[PDB]
Structure formats: C-alpha cells, structure tokens
Amino acid sequence: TESQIPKMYEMIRDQMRTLASTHKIPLNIDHNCEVIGSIIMAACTNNRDLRPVDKYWFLMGPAGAEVMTEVEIDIQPQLQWAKGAVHDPKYKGQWYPFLALLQISNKTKDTILWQKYPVTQELEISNSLEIYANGHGIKDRLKNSRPRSVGPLVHLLHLKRLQENSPAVNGIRKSIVGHLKRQCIGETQKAMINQFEMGRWESLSTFAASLLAIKPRIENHFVLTYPLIANCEDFAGATLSDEWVFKAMEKISNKKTLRVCGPDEKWISFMNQIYIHSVFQTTGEDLGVLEWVFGGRFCQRKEFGRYCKKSQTKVIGLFTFQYEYWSKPLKSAPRSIESFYDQVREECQKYMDLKVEGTTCFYRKGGHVEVEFPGSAHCNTYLFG
Amino acid sequence: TESQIPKMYEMIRDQMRTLASTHKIPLNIDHNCEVIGSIIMAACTNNRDLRPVDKYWFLMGPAGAEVMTEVEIDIQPQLQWAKGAVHDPKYKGQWYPFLALLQISNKTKDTILWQKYPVTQELEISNSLEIYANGHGIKDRLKNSRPRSVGPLVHLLHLKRLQENSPAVNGIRKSIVGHLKRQCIGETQKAMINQFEMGRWESLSTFAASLLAIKPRIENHFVLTYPLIANCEDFAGATLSDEWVFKAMEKISNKKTLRVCGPDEKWISFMNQIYIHSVFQTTGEDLGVLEWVFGGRFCQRKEFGRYCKKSQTKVIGLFTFQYEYWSKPLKSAPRSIEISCRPSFKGKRPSYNNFTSSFYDQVREECQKYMDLKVEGTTCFYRKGGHVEVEFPGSAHCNTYLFG
Amino acid sequence: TESQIPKMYEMIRDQMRTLASTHKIPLNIDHNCEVIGSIIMAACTNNRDLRPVDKYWFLMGPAGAEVMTEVEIDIQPQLQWAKGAVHDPKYKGQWYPFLALLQISNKTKDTILWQKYPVTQELEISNSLEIYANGHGIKDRLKNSRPRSVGPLVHLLHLKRLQENSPAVNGIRKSIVGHLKRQCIGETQKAMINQFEMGRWESLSTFAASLLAIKPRIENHFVLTYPLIANCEDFAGATLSDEWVFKAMEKISNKKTLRVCGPDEKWISFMNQIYIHSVFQTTGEDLGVLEWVFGGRFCQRKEFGRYCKKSQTKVIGLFTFQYEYWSKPLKSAPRSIEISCRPSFKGKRPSYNNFTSSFYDQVREECQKYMDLKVEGTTCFYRKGGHVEVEFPGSAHCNTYLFG
C-alpha cells in the first residue's frame, strides 16, 4: 500500500507542471493549480469527460499582475500519460486506491467554499451530517477501489440509489453494504444498516441520530493538494502513515511561494486553514485540536459570506502553515469501546460517555512521541459547527 | 466594470454634439437628440444599417421656432470612430457591454410613448409581463454582451424562436438559457425554464404567473439618455453605482436648457417622468416609489391618449427633474428568501436545544413563499447628497404603475 | 472516398489477426473469424457494448481438431486502436462511412441463417420485401454516416418509430426523409414518403407494393467479410469500384485455407453462396444472375431447415468459389425510367418541321412503368480479368431469389 507511495507523487507533479508550464500558467496561484488539477484529476479517472483542448479559468499575469481570463490548453500530452498508469504493474494495482484518495481531498475546497449537503438532503436527514458523507461525487470505480474512504452516507445514498435506480447490481451493493458495515463498527449499527440494504428508511433519521453518538470508522490518508503537489519538490520519503506529510507540506509553507484566491483579502486566514482541512482531511476536526495540533486558531465558515464566483475570485495572499503535533491517520473508528430503538440508543449512550478517542495517541512535531491531547478553549467550535 | 465609464461618456457626447451641430441641429430639443442619438447608436454596433446620408425628423428653428421638416445629415465621420471603437483596447473590451446598456435605455421612451408588448404576445403570456421582457430589439451581439440587462422574456423569446419551429444554434441557446437561469433566481423557475429550453410552453403561462409571484433578478445601471448626455458637461465622477447620475440629472434639470416634444402641452409632466423612467430604467416601477424618491407625482399612460407621430412632435415645454433619495442599481435579486447543532466531539458542554418540540404546486409554493415575503431589495436606499440609508416608509401611490 | 480504403483494410486485417493470435484462436474456421470480427466492429463504433475481456464461442483445435468452446480474449489492445481511429484525421472523415459499410456487410450471415424480417414486420408490410431493408441494427452514427447504404425500409422504420411516439428530432427526421427520397427515386414514391414524413401510413402497404414494383436506389460497396479479410494477403489496389475485390477474394478461395461451419455438411454449398452474398451484397440478387456470374447454382434458404445454434455449429468443409463475370457496385437505382423550332427573331424565314402531325392511381402508374422495365442495372457487367462490358442474357434460375 505504502510501498509505491513515494513514487506516485513525483510524476503526478510532473504532468501537473507540464500542463501549466506549457501554456504559461503560473503554479504559484491555488486557482491555477486547482483548475489545472481539476484537469489533472480528470485525466486520471474519467478520461472521456475532459476535452483534449479546452479553456479554463486561471490567473494570467507575471509577478503578481494576474487577472482572471479563460486560457486554452492542450491536454492531449497529459491525456496519453494518465491512461497508461491504470494497469501499469509498477503500481501493483494500487493506482485505483491512490486515485480515490486524490479525488476526495482536492474536491474538499469546492465543498468548503460552496457549502452544500447533497447526500443528507437526498437521504432526507439532518443537513449537518454531510460531514459523515465524505466521498460524494467520486467515481464508482474509485468508490469500489477505496470504499472505506468513502463515507457511509454516500454508500448509504448509493445503497439508496441502488434501490432507487441484473445480478451485477448485487455486486455493487455488496461492496456498498459490506463496506457500510465495515465503516460503522457499532454492534447495533451494523444490523441497523441491514434494513437499509432492503430499502426501508424509517431508521434513516435514526441512522441520522445514530451518527451523533457512534462515529463510523473512516479511513484517512494524508494526501497533498495540487497547489502543494506542484510546489512540493521532495517525495523521497513520501508515505501515508507518519509525519512526512506534516513536515513536507510545512516546507511549501516555509517557501511562501504559493498564493491563494478568494472574494477578498479577509479569506487569507480562512483559505490557509482550508489547506489544513483538505490535506489532512481535518475539515471535520475540532478547531481546538486544530488550534493545538497546528498552533493557530481556525476560522469557521460562518465568519465569511458566500464565496464569490470562480470567474471573479482574486489572489488574496500567500499560503502559510504551521503545526506542533500530529497523529497517525484514523484507521479504526475514533470512538472505540474495545425495543430496538432502545438498544440503538443504548449503544448510542455508550459512545457519548466515552472521553478519549484515537487508536494509540497524538504525536508531537518532529517524531512519533506520544503526546495526549490536553484540550483547548475552542471546544465545540467547528468549520460547519 | 466602471473604470471605463468616466471616459466613455466623453467621446459619446463629443460625437453626439458633432453630428447635430454640423447641420444646425439644436441640442435643446429632445426629439432632436432622440433621433440624432438613434442615428449615433446605429453606428456603434450595427454599422451596416444606418445610411451615410439620410433625412430624418428633427426640430429646426431659432429661439423656439422649431418645426417638423426633414434635413439630410452626414454620419460618415461618426462611422469611422464607432467601428474602430468596437475593438478599441482603450475600453478594455467593455464597448459592447457598455453599448448594450445604451441601446436598451434609449429605445424605452418609444415603448413608453407607443405602448407595445412584442415579446409577451409572442410568448403567449400576459401583456403586463413586458416588465420582464426588457431588452427587446437589441442586437444579438449586445444580447450576448449584456444578457443580464436584457429581460428573461426576450431571452425566453430568443429561446422560443429557437424551438418555434447547426452546432452554433446551441451556443446562442446555452447562453440564452443560462442567462434565463441567472436572471430568474427561483428554484422552481430555474428548473421550469430549462423545460422551456426543451421546447414545451404549457407552463409558459405558469411562468407568466410565476414571474408575477417570484420576481427575477434584473441587473441595472444608471445611464443617461441622448438629451441629457449632450446637456451634461461633467463626467469626472461618471460611474454606474453611486449618486453621480442622480446628481448629474439634477444639474441638467437645474440648467433647464432642454425641451421636450409631444402631441400637446399636457405631456410635459408625462415626459419629465419619462426622463426619470428612462435614465434609471424605472418604467414599470411603482408610482408611489418614484413619488417619494423624486418628490413629485408620476402620471400614467391612461391619463393621455395615443402618442402623436414622430413627424409631428412639437416643443411643449422645458425638461425638469428633481430627486430626494436614490439607491444603488439592482445587482442581486430583490426578493430573497435566503434550531439544532450537531455535537461532533468528545468535549462536552451544557446541552442546548433551540426547539421546544406537485411541480406546479412547488412553483406555487415558491410563489407562496414570495407571497409571504414582506421585504424586497438587497441592502438599502441612499439619500440625496450622500449614501445615508433611508428605508422606504411607504407612499399613497403605491401598488400603481405607469402602465398599470 | 477510395483513397483510405487500402490502409483501412490493412489495419483491419492486422487487428483481425492480432486478437486471434494473442490467444491462439485459429483463423481457418469461419465461426472464429466471424465472432472475432464482430467483437472488433463492436469495438469500432459502439465501444460501450462489448467488454474489454470476454468469452465467446470459438473453435479450439490444431489441424482440424477444433471443437466449440468459449475462449477469453483481451480486446483492450484492439479497443484502443478502434477508439483512436474514430476521429483520426488520416481518414478525411471517411472512417464513419467505412465502418458503416463494414457493419452492414458483416451483419448478414446471421440474418441469412436465422431468417427473420424485423423491419417489414415492424412496418406491418409484406415480409418478403425485407429485400429493401438493408442496414437495420447499425449504429445511429453509422446510419447517418452511410444512410444511402442503409436501405429505404430501415430509414422508413426509423421514421415510423419517430411517428409512433427538440431540434435533434427535426434533424434526424429530415435526414431520414431526405435519404428515403434519395433511395426511392419514384416521384409518387417520393410524394408518399413525404406523406409518411408528416404521417400517413395508409400508403405504407402501398409503399411495400411500390418497393416490390419500383425498385429503390441501393448504393453498394465491395467490402469483404471477417474470414476473408483475415485470409486476404493483398491490399495494394484496394478500391471500391473495380475488379480488385473480385480477384482478391477469388485468390483467397483458390487458397482454400478457410473452413465454414454449419449444422451438417450439406450446408457447404449454402455457406459458399452465403459468402458470395455477403461479399457482393447479392442476397437479394436474382439467383439466375448469380449462377451465370459465378458459374454455380445458389441454394435457397428453403432447401435447408432451421440453422442450428451457434453453440452446436460445426466445421462442414472448406470455402470454395469461382466466378466468370463482375461489375461495379450499383450507384443509382437499378430500375431507371430516365421536332419544332422556337423563333425568337422577328424576320420571316421558311418554317421547317421534323413531324408531319387519385394519388394511389399515380403510384400504381409508376409501379406499372417500372414493370415495363425489362432491363435491370445501370451500365453493364464486366468479364473477369478486366472491365469489358457484358450483359446477362438469362438463366434457368431467373426471377428466383435466396428467400424467394
């Protein structure tokens, strides 16, 4: 799994810069990278969606003189490379597992700027649980490649979609349902997802209520973003379960070469934290932990108005980042304990009474030293909370 | 957007006076300015329409002795500048965006004087909906330059014309439909305008009723007319989102150097309001709205008979204008419809609760949601001489319109 | 049109042999080549129908020891070429018409063996008139690519589907009706096709009767089938309007390297004639004409019972062929129904003379006019070895057909 990780980040960045540098697209703007990366992610998984040549929004201008305009690019040099890496034996079949992680992380910024709740609204449940609906909008092949990363609600929605859409239908469903059970480690929750397999959703609100107390296991991986991938020049020790990502991304922040875009300059702090939200998948992490781990306050979405149109987003400042702690990616469920509704509420009260989460512990910057989180004054402060 | 406006009003006026003053066409008559300005704009976008020399109706006479006769004029000097201004880098590509605003406002007076409803009748809907059929008769290049100003119904008509019965047809339609959706912010309206793109128009009458209930976003900009542009000697602070246009009209109104032409002298008040109607694009606005802002009653079209021909519009009085308040032009949608928290971490707190315990119908529900709205607008008003927020208290002439 | 044909055939043969030889599929059995070529053609246009890896009925065995079994194949190397050739500029836009011709030619053997009449049955007309329903089941992109090759009844079937149930609908309908008029050269046939266009199928049975009487224009091209393409080693002069195809496939037959399959060995002559029909599109041709041209009798479908299942089809003998005459592919309709002075000059001149002195009714008049035509074809036959003009005088199997 992590054997080929150090090499994938190299040629991903190579075509990341090749497409931008071919048509004089600077890589120090996040929007240029994100849109190029949106083209880059397009070539990786959905080959037939992106055009061989097309115009996209970028920042054209030398030395801070960038003004938004639509720039045509020749993606064909980048299209031929991407299709060959799907079944390349050098990746040992890990291209699909890797691409699912890349697709989810880089779409986080679009969701943060434009706060939408597609899965929960389609599930007719509370909108503040789309945080549990990670992995929406990702390719089904990627959803069958890393279903663990894709949140249960998306699979539950796909389970709902599969019932609201042929023996091959079961094969998708069993992957959907089986990884629904794998993600939700609750003894009652596993049986309480089973009726969703049949297709009755009276407990869907109860499933919505369940997501409060019992947290489904969400496998996470530290993946850099296109504004950082193109700006990261070191990938020798690029792995997924240590402090390399924290240290390597800080080097990009220490360079202070990458710039960020927004409606106005007030978003400079907000957009800097978006990188922390996207790279470490800490969109749903507590700001107090974010303040403790990363040594700085995090701005909530409520502090800012509607995100302006991508055609009028303007460079608002340089990218910065700092951190003091870290942790191994969340492999098992965070909350661990290692009438039917009464039993569901019974297991629900079990995880509400718990006080400490985590597999082993948090780790301080500079190594894997066990440093348990003490707490912070920003309890119950979240980006969408 | 507004960067080129201060300079744009300069050469427009310079060519406006040059054409009139060349052939002893006085600039103090609206019909002189209206017809001359109508010729001026033709050179701007559709260069192949206006004749190099032609005879039109003006008011020729010294010191009030103006009479209807036709005198030929030469437009070729204006043609060269206008065609070169189409791709002139000095405007930063804002020539067509600025020209589309000019074309719509100037043709409004003819629609006011000659009450016609082309788009709505061609869209088999209510005639009172030409309020949302703004921007008819404009050049398609302009209609692709400032489609936001062009009302949805004209685009809906331009949409209807495509399905009234080539990959380039879709490109016109995709913009037209896209600018339909941008203008009409209704969640149901956005969905049920797309069904109009398919080719069905049974809910076009529902869209007729929806337009009455849900009020679409219509971008506006404060642009002067031909009689005022020729009479405006100051353009230093000429922008599109402040009181400069309101102040400029008052400065021209205080000058009283402009005359209007109509069937008879009773139309002096009607045309004075037309200047208020045309410059700020407030033809369909509530009368009580304009009376409070502009400190005077606004006459209706029913109070007067049919408008006389442009070949017999005689001087009837001096142009006057007065205003006491103003507001920024409509950018977003005026009517905007825009109890628990989900504790996600271990860190507990005092638990708080803020709660103690069809498609046509969906359109009607969105209609009903806009029925329950007591509030219009985006931010606020601004009083004359500044930008002090003075919210509308109400007026007696409310709920009444020029064509209502 | 014929410029890209040689390289087209060359790469078709290359993929034909590559996909079979990758998994040791012998190319000397008709069924192996037919199935592999069907997979290749599925890769060519409807790329989403076939699978990247799949199992199909093939004959595995060395030196005549082949038995039916399903063999997995890796179509992805062929899929990549098929999808990359879709819009390769090297074909000058002739890739789609060439693929349409290939599919039309290669979708014939299964229909011959399993005698079905889908188009006529769906059109509620005479089933024996499927002879004018060429090009059914082809991709819509291909059907627009070679609509002329697509038979008049298939276009009429698409029109009937449109009538039975958006500018795309208008475009598809107008293309269908135009190609119907092009194929059916009958003036009354054209007018009643137009009647079908708005929708009047009271003449649909009349349309069948006319097609039976008036024979519509059928464009054709000489394209080999999968087994013969895999067995063709010459593509130097590969065009579509000469004897190159005849000479090449005669040489292939003389090679005697291809085996055909069937329920029993009595079908050897039937399969040889099926190959002749598929190569020269002569399924509907008069059996006397075919016997005279190819020097051999053509067995009708009536002479053989139901074709056995593709699972139980077994090798029945080597493919053999001979011919003595050829001709170009037919371009226009095979049946074609194609003394005084006018002084403009005031001066007196002597005069000089050569001469001493219901809608269904019109449709039947045209029918009888085409009955009066005893000659079929446009230009001539050609004898083997050159383009010397020949004419068929008559044969015992005249007025007899494969399904007649």
Coordinates of N, CA, C and O in Angstrom, one line a residue, chain B residues 12 95 127 132-133 161 175 245 255 333:
Chain B
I12 N -18.7 59.9 -26.5 CA -20.1 59.7 -26.9 C -20.8 61.0 -27.0 O -21.5 61.3 -28.0
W95 N -16.7 47.9 -24.6 CA -17.5 48.7 -25.6 C -18.9 48.1 -25.8 O -19.9 48.7 -25.5
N127 N -49.9 40.5 -21.1 CA -49.3 41.7 -21.6 C -48.6 42.5 -20.6 O -47.6 43.2 -20.9
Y132 N -40.8 42.2 -17.5 CA -39.7 41.2 -17.6 C -39.2 40.9 -19.0 O -38.4 40.0 -19.2
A133 N -39.8 41.6 -20.0 CA -39.4 41.5 -21.4 C -38.5 42.6 -21.8 O -38.6 43.1 -22.9
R161 N -37.9 31.4 -30.1 CA -37.6 31.4 -31.5 C -36.8 30.2 -32.0 O -36.9 29.8 -33.1
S175 N -26.2 30.1 -23.8 CA -26.1 31.4 -23.1 C -27.5 31.9 -22.8 O -27.8 32.3 -21.6
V245 N -25.0 59.9 -11.3 CA -26.1 60.0 -12.3 C -27.3 60.8 -11.7 O -27.8 61.7 -12.4
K255 N -30.3 73.4 -15.0 CA -30.0 74.2 -16.1 C -31.2 74.6 -16.9 O -31.3 75.8 -17.4
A333 N -30.9 39.6 -6.5 CA -32.3 39.5 -6.6 C -32.9 40.3 -5.4 O -32.5 40.1 -4.3

